[PDB]
RNA sequence: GAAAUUGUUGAAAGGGAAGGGCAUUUGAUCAGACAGGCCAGCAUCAGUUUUGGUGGCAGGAUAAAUCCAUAGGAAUGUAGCUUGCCUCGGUAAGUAUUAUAGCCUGUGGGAAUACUGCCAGCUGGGACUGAGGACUGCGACGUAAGUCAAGGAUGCUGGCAUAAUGGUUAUAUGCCGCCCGUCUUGAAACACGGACCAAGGAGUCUAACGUCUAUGCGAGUGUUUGGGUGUAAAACCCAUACGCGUAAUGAAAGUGAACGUAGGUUGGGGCCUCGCAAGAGGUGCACAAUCGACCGAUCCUGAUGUCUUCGGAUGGAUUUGAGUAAGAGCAUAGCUGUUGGGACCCGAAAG
RNA sequence: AAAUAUGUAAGAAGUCCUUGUUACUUAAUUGAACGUGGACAUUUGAAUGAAGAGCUUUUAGUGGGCCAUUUUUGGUAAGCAGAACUGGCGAUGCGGGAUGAACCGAACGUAGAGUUAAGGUGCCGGAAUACACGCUCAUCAGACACCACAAAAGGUGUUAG
RNA sequence: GCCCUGAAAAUGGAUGGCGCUCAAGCGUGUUACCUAUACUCUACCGUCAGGGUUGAUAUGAUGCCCUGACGAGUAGGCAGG
RNA sequence: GUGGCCUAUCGAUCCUUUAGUCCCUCGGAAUUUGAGGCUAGAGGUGCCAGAAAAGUUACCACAGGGAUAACUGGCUUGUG
């Protein structure tokens, strides 16, 4: 995630270079940082999909 | 290599500009391009796209159609918006006192609206009065009443009009159209 | 305009993950384990060495 | 006064073709800036990557072993002992389980190391890249001022300023490269056309049409048969007709499109009301599906009245139409497609 | 009586309650069909994905095919003839199989750096005349899929059982 | 198992060639290394898609600018020159 | 119960002819014959989505075809 992590925003591939973009797209699920995204993956949480 | 699930370099398939070279029409497109970008009003986006339509996609709207729409509940004082031509209809004998904005008015249509106490305005005048389409009513004419449509989808048991030049007794009413001559469709 | 990889650019590693400063300060990557002296039962050892 | 083709002169290459592609050497030739142009060296950074040294942790039989303590056992039997030949000590086979060597198995004790994994541990060498061009963002280090490796390279220095770099061209060297066009499942083919060069050489125009698009006017539309007029095949102006459209349906005689806000239901953009928003409600054009109503045809029902055979009111029917249900068309132009014409160009044996 | 293929379903056009219409149906407001009114929101009814979904008009070329793995018919067989599913060639270069339309790898804008695929690393030829345990001596050894062949039957040659 | 007998065709001849015998052969195991128009990162060209920007006083709103993805092709279609 | 227990047992346009409706037309106006229409069948195309059709060329012609036979060559080897 740190090296090759890109997000899908408006059908576009955007690098995850700051926590602001993650919050703006996954904040409604409680994910607001790159570590929150990692936590949701390693522990398969309610919002894994 | 990439396994493509869809066609690459595919155009959207919608017109982004009018095909005509009318200089005055381009000015209206420039006005509503600015409004659609900086108003987030759904009305402005609809009007801008309607300015790109071809002639068959903008059927005429008669004054009788305008009068019928004004008879709707609560629509008596709304401004009728037609992106196209408004024609006259002599089959109706009473007309309201509404305000109509359209690209073009025929001589009969303009006279009938003014005689009833209304006014005919252009689309740029409408933008000044209602920049966000306040209290407007958009009317579109009928597309499937065109003569070309009745020939589309021709085939057995389809009930469509054949493409024929001369119509009469001896023109495509024999075998294939009646049971006494072979079969019926 | 240029993707800078964290874990090789320390400044970018600090912009994300404000806990990296605490992780390095207390040496969480070399944390020792508490010593325990529990031993396996005889049945486990005999089964392991059984033919 | 072009090309095919040829003479002379000059330059270059040539061991069973020649010609070509990528790269550079050599020869020849040539443009650009000298107002910072050409080529380089080092340092500090950013991006990508390659190859070493080194540190701290975790796991397993909490590695297994080694090592240490202890019990038992055996031989490919150590010391000792017996036995027979033996160039006065060397073998040979019996006994003998640690003694003057040792080994194996079980149990107990404490570590190390291997293997695998982790570190938001540290650090050396090499290569490629420098996109962007005022500021804006997110962070770091600091009491603060500020600084910084934080949304893309700067600093210092040297040589040369011209054929030195580079371009062009000929040649050489390394590797690669079969003759194009055509029909074909398949062509370098022992399949066909082509010795060479120049000029010429093949989807055109017309009548009538389909879809789409542009333009004018719009329930209408079309001035150009003709007339008027003229700066005279132009431009300008115009009456009456006619064409198409505005009604359909029957073989025909014929008849001929509102029970209703021009119907109901479902989905609908936009607009309206309220609401911070999300939403809810109202109205809903175009368009899609469906149930009805209306007009013509077909099959039935047959009222008041009568030239007693005419007339066809009213009500129906798993029937039928290229219909109605607040009109959309007419004219001109363009690409594409269709048919008749020599019909993309050249070609029969015949009549 | 399999395996592989194959139909349908997994909700708002849904479920529940009450009662309106009819010339159909029932001994009978009984039922059938379509409705009025009320309640139930998107962990609203499995998973994954979704370069957005739906729809219309018009026209080009084509209508000789062929090959490979698997299934399979005729035939002694065929680089023979004929079918089934899929992938290919035709229409396609590039790395590999010396060479080849179809095999293997991988599909292609112009460049730089790094890493690989299939295949290879004595010399031609870029890369270990590397490491490890065995086997084989041929007076016609052997050497890598498609693939460019070899059998029955034999040997106190040698090796293991 | 390997090797040998069985094993006869016409120009001269082909594990690709040279050559190779504890192999440079056969079976098997472990590492290092070589190189595609494939993969990763960067630049540039074009195409497509989603966006920003009309404010006068300086010229192209078919302008300028931001972001992401993509690029084989006969018969054939369309577009810009 | 809308032919044969089920799975086959069959036929357009033009023309002729029959049945039905006794209805429509013969266009200057009528009556009667005649003819022409409307709805449903029959007469048949078996090359069965349906031209009306005998040979010969060793006197021969043209457009083509290696989409296809009469030699080699290649694959195969039944047969020899
Ligand atoms: Cl060369
Ligand atoms: Cl009639
Ligand atoms: Mg002269
Ligand atoms: Mg000459
Ligand atoms: Mg040079
Ligand atoms: Mg070659
Ligand atoms: Mg052939
Ligand atoms: Mg060829
Ligand atoms: Mg020929
Ligand atoms: Mg010739
Ligand atoms: Mg010429
Ligand atoms: Mg001729
Ligand atoms: Mg004749
Ligand atoms: Mg072909
Ligand atoms: Mg080969
Ligand atoms: Mg080498
Ligand atoms: Mg080997
Ligand atoms: Mg292309
Ligand atoms: Mg019977
Ligand atoms: Mg029966
Ligand atoms: Mg007469
Ligand atoms: Mg037939
Ligand atoms: Mg042939
Ligand atoms: Mg035989």
From Swiss-Prot, chain A:
<protein>
    <recommendedName>
        <fullName>Large ribosomal subunit protein uL30A</fullName>
    </recommendedName>
</protein>
<comment type="function">
    <text>Component of the ribosome, a large ribonucleoprotein complex responsible for the synthesis of proteins in the cell. The small ribosomal subunit (SSU) binds messenger RNAs (mRNAs) and translates the encoded message by selecting cognate aminoacyl-transfer RNA (tRNA) molecules. The large subunit (LSU) contains the ribosomal catalytic site termed the peptidyl transferase center (PTC), which catalyzes the formation of peptide bonds, thereby polymerizing the amino acids delivered by tRNAs into a polypeptide chain.</text>
</comment>
<comment type="subunit">
    <text>Component of the large ribosomal subunit (LSU). Mature yeast ribosomes consist of a small (40S) and a large (60S) subunit. The 40S small subunit contains 1 molecule of ribosomal RNA (18S rRNA) and 33 different proteins (encoded by 57 genes). The large 60S subunit contains 3 rRNA molecules (25S, 5.8S and 5S rRNA) and 46 different proteins (encoded by 81 genes).</text>
</comment>
<comment type="similarity">
    <text>Belongs to the universal ribosomal protein uL30 family.</text>
</comment>
Swiss-Prot record, chain B:
<feature type="modified residue" description="N6,N6,N6-trimethyllysine">
    <location>
        <position position="49"/>
    </location>
</feature>
<dbReference type="InterPro" id="IPR000039">
    <property type="entry name" value="Ribosomal_eL18"/>
</dbReference>
<dbReference type="GO" id="GO:0002181">
    <property type="term" value="P:cytoplasmic translation"/>
</dbReference>
<dbReference type="InterPro" id="IPR036227">
    <property type="entry name" value="Ribosomal_uL15/eL18_sf"/>
</dbReference>
<protein>
    <recommendedName>
        <fullName>Large ribosomal subunit protein eL18A</fullName>
    </recommendedName>
</protein>
<keyword id="KW-1017">Isopeptide bond</keyword>
<dbReference type="InterPro" id="IPR021131">
    <property type="entry name" value="Ribosomal_uL15/eL18"/>
</dbReference>
<dbReference type="GO" id="GO:0005829">
    <property type="term" value="C:cytosol"/>
</dbReference>
<comment type="subunit">
    <text>Component of the large ribosomal subunit (LSU). Mature yeast ribosomes consist of a small (40S) and a large (60S) subunit. The 40S small subunit contains 1 molecule of ribosomal RNA (18S rRNA) and 33 different proteins (encoded by 57 genes). The large 60S subunit contains 3 rRNA molecules (25S, 5.8S and 5S rRNA) and 46 different proteins (encoded by 81 genes). eL18 interacts with NAP1.</text>
</comment>
<dbReference type="GO" id="GO:0003723">
    <property type="term" value="F:RNA binding"/>
</dbReference>
<keyword id="KW-0687">Ribonucleoprotein</keyword>
<dbReference type="GO" id="GO:0022625">
    <property type="term" value="C:cytosolic large ribosomal subunit"/>
</dbReference>
<keyword id="KW-0832">Ubl conjugation</keyword>
<comment type="function">
    <text>Component of the ribosome, a large ribonucleoprotein complex responsible for the synthesis of proteins in the cell. The small ribosomal subunit (SSU) binds messenger RNAs (mRNAs) and translates the encoded message by selecting cognate aminoacyl-transfer RNA (tRNA) molecules. The large subunit (LSU) contains the ribosomal catalytic site termed the peptidyl transferase center (PTC), which catalyzes the formation of peptide bonds, thereby polymerizing the amino acids delivered by tRNAs into a polypeptide chain.</text>
</comment>
<keyword id="KW-0963">Cytoplasm</keyword>
Swiss-Prot record, chain C:
<comment type="similarity">
    <text>Belongs to the universal ribosomal protein uL4 family.</text>
</comment>
<protein>
    <recommendedName>
        <fullName>Large ribosomal subunit protein uL4A</fullName>
    </recommendedName>
</protein>
<comment type="function">
    <text>Component of the ribosome, a large ribonucleoprotein complex responsible for the synthesis of proteins in the cell. The small ribosomal subunit (SSU) binds messenger RNAs (mRNAs) and translates the encoded message by selecting cognate aminoacyl-transfer RNA (tRNA) molecules. The large subunit (LSU) contains the ribosomal catalytic site termed the peptidyl transferase center (PTC), which catalyzes the formation of peptide bonds, thereby polymerizing the amino acids delivered by tRNAs into a polypeptide chain.</text>
</comment>
<comment type="subunit">
    <text>Component of the large ribosomal subunit (LSU). Mature yeast ribosomes consist of a small (40S) and a large (60S) subunit. The 40S small subunit contains 1 molecule of ribosomal RNA (18S rRNA) and 33 different proteins (encoded by 57 genes). The large 60S subunit contains 3 rRNA molecules (25S, 5.8S and 5S rRNA) and 46 different proteins (encoded by 81 genes). uL4 is associated with the polypeptide exit tunnel. uL4 interacts with its chaperone ACL4 and the nuclear import receptor KAP104.</text>
</comment>
